[PDB]
């Protein structure tokens, strides 16, 4: 590994995109070379994080898919000014094989 990408490879952030975009994205990552991927979401985006992984584990690979770890908690992040805001963050790590 000597490339160095500013773009994250194994971590995705749930924004305002339709769930279908994230589902196909994770599937593409498996065939791209990433077997363990972590979907990170926060606030009201938590609902999509689970919705995405639930589809992925009950559609393309059910028996063969495996869970790695699931953690939910409030993270201290900074606002646009520089204000400490606590936001409920969730890291979902799944293992594809």
Instruction: Give the annotated binding-site residues for RNA.
Output: 16-17, 22, 42, 44
Q: What is the dihedral of CA 26, 28, 23, 77, to 10 degrees?
A: 40
| Binders in 12-41 for a copy of itself, by CB under 8 A | none
What does residue 60 show for φ and ψ, rounded to 5 degrees? -85, -50
Tell me which residues in 42-81 interact with a copy of itself (CB under 8 A): 43-44, 46-47, 50-51, 54, 58, 70, 72, 74
- Cβ atoms of 13 and 43 within 8 Å: the answer is no
Binding site for a copy of itself (CB under 8 A): 43-44, 46-47, 50-51, 54, 58, 70, 72, 74, 86, 88
């Amino acid at each position: 590994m000597s490339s160095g990408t500013p773009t994250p490879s194994n971590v995705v952030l749930i924004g305002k995109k339709p769930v279908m975009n994230y589902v196909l994205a994770a599937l593409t990552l498996l065939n791209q070379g990433v077997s363990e991927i972590v979907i990170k979401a926060r606030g009201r985006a938590i609902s999509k994080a689970v919705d995405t992984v639930e589809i992925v584990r009950n559609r393309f690979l059910a028996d063969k898919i495996e869970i790695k770890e699931i953690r939910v908690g409030s993270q201290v992040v900074t606002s646009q000014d520089g204000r400490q805001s606590r936001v409920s963050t969730i890291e979902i790590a799944i293992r594809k094989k």
